Assembly symmetry: D2
Homo-oligomer: 259 residues x 4
């Protein structure tokens, strides 16, 4: 099956930022034809730790910017929703509606996304056990969702630290396609946080174990990003990472267990 | 004064709310030292299963809660799940409760603060004690003056919550702290036998109040049936924690 | 039942240190007649993180120093063993043989302690669940132990941090007398560690929940201690702490659940 | 060269050791690129239950292991539990293994190092990756030149271990790293279905070798019966990790 790569800047800092990242993602989509690329960016960071942190430029501006990326590069789109009313307007441009980690249990939000007819990708809550995502998928199917993804992004391990229990990949694969969030899994919640040095090794682990796609927030200059500055992957490094995981996936694939 | 927030997990009917409210009223008269706040949810918006009980709706719930406040003169608290609900709920709720999974949702917190009511945030199972400082800051920015942080356990491996009591003195630096005695012993995705021992610990350590979901017949509850405290055991636990608090309070750190 | 208070300097830094702490413990034993005091100190710190840290002055010197405390003040004694051969010599002076946390599963060590006829106190391993101490008690009884204690000293919570799950107290009480380690429970393993500011609040929690005794490492000047300098309680504060827990125990006692 | 440490958890008999050793020898001939080390314990000194199988003693175990090395020319490794055992075990053991619970016992580590043999320390379930630096330092101080650190999972809530793969690159800073594929999936006080997926992850991340307890009939094993890999599946897993390593090694960080 075509490998999925969801990538883009964490937040829609500006329409210019999106087009710049979109251009590179488009270039990579032309090279890696065996990969299905989906451009990602949030119109709002609704769960920042501090009230003083950057949130965004609003839904309207965000949807408009994402539409430009889709029209200019012909790339599929994904963004996250935070409250039920946002599903409808967002569904106008988003091919995949993303459900934030902390909201993976909010029934109305999941139902709102499912009835749009769009694909739905749920970030697995840091408090959730792998086997408990079965009911999350059940809610989505109940709501009309036909294309469902579950994204592994770490589990609470002590304070301000997340661990990736790779046993979750084959467990969740029992009821949905699985995506591995390479940048969210190395963040240190309320750290100041994150450790970029572990992004690559863990993504290699993900593809060796076996998943249906990877999720990576990428920015031209992570050091200057307005959100997740400690975990976003430098755009210049995206190509090499993708080539590497495709190579590891190929050699490991014959050993992937059947569900 | 010491705060005691109690009531059935969900508003299964205003009939249930009236039976529990009657008991809460009686204790309210017996323990004048304590401030009682009646609690119940008009919607269980985060059930694991799509087939579980959610409730009878916001309107039916506000009506029922309104009846309790009018029939017993008790303060009220209920939780909201999306920003638009803050305004209508603030009509009856003296304290607006923010669910644990939603403790980081800026708009929900701001919407609760805008109502001018007191706000009680359930500390997420994913949050470290010191990270609640920012939660308080958001509420203050939104105009909230009476802010509470409720300890309800922290993720400890899978399907288990542990109570790190170091959180009580840490959170007290920026807000009044409440201890959720029934939620802290639940096993996500609980053990009633640990409710009393841990609530005794909470008052020995020092808190500003306790939170307890209570039902006449927990086993018959439509939500949190495994952790809700039988209504008949409430008086005994309250008298017990008041006695322990009386003695231990001498040592609560400044 | 008489409340147990096990206290003393973490390590036998010198015979002079022991006698100084012993004098104060003796004074407190005369005041708090309802308490059973047991003087504690290790002749060897066999599990230090660094090879350069203080270990001790040997078993011989240690036993001799402890014997002096017992002869001079008439106080019961306890110290820990690290290998089976140490049980016999140590049993000559120790009323209670302590089993280190990391060694709570070492069958031969537990058996060696049990056959001495002395009481045995096992520090619960940071990796052990409360219900798994049932087999630890079974091993000790199998080995001849008639007086057994289980000591709560925290559980691994993420890296370099320990949490105290107070549910362990009533669980372990099902098969043995329970002791709460007030100083070990606030240490940050490999922290540099520990947080002395939490010693008092947590010990209050312990007695409110209900335990059979408390364990506290105390030193005249913790800041200058050769081991556990970040968690040992200043000797001057011991009296107040004991009075406080006795008061809280009394008021909470009528509510202690029956096993 | 890449290291593969494998053998039955316990020396249930030298008869068992010979059957497994025969298979390990065959793979040794098939995979010349890999260095095989036969492993088995002469004593399970940390069983949860006093009524569980421990073994036939040190002497019987050393004898059995001695037979494997002589009959197959395979290197040997076994674990010690108390300092006095280092010397007698060093007679046959090329690598002395230190149990996870005992990774902080200074005298045991020093005794292992004094023998002049290589030392492999199982990382305690209570240890953070960076704290193994001090473990290595103790061994170096004791005269050890060939030092290995084995990842075998970390305490995650109760009766569960999680493998934090960030540990591999962190520990590689001061020692050769081995991944225990069978111990990492056990549930203290396991799931065989996760052995292969996680070992694939280990080689994709990058390690210096793998550790696997294997038995002809795991279900009939006297120890770790729930995690031991069936002997017949060993060749397939080895070929698989060698292929993955061949491709992924290009990306192992310096």
């Amino acid at each position: 099956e075509k490998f999925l790569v969801i990538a883009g800047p964490c937040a829609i800092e500006s329409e210019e930022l999106l087009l710049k990242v979109g251009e590179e993602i488009k270039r990579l989509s032309e090279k890696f034809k065996e990969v299905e690329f989906v451009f990602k960016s949030s119109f709002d960071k609704a769960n920042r730790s501090s009230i003083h942190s950057f949130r965004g430029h609003g839904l309207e501006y965000g949807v408009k910017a994402l539409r430009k990326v889709k029209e200019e590069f012909g790339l599929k789109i994904t963004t996250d929703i935070h409250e039920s009313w946002q599903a409808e307007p967002v569904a106008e441009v988003a091919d995949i509606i993303q459900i934030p980690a902390f909201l993976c249990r909010q029934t109305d939000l999941l139902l709102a996304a499912a009835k749009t007819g769009r694909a739905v990708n749920v970030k697995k809550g840091q408090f959730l056990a792998p086997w408990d995502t079965k009911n999350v998928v059940e809610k989505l199917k109940f709501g009309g969702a036909k294309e469902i993804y579950l994204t592994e992004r770490g589990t609470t391990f002590g304070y301000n630290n997340l661990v990736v229990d790779f046993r979750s990949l084959p467990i969740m694969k029992q009821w949905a396609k699985v995506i591995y969030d390479a940048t969210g899994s190395v963040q240190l919640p309320g750290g100041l946080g994150g450790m970029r040095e572990f992004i690559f090794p863990l993504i290699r682990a993900a593809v060796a174990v076996g998943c249906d796609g990877v999720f990576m927030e990428t920015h031209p200059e992570p050091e200057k990003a307005l959100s997740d500055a400690s975990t976003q992957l430098p755009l210049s490094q995206l190509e090499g990472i993708i080539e590497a995981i495709l190579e590891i996936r190929e050699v490991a694939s014959k050993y992937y267990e059947t569900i």
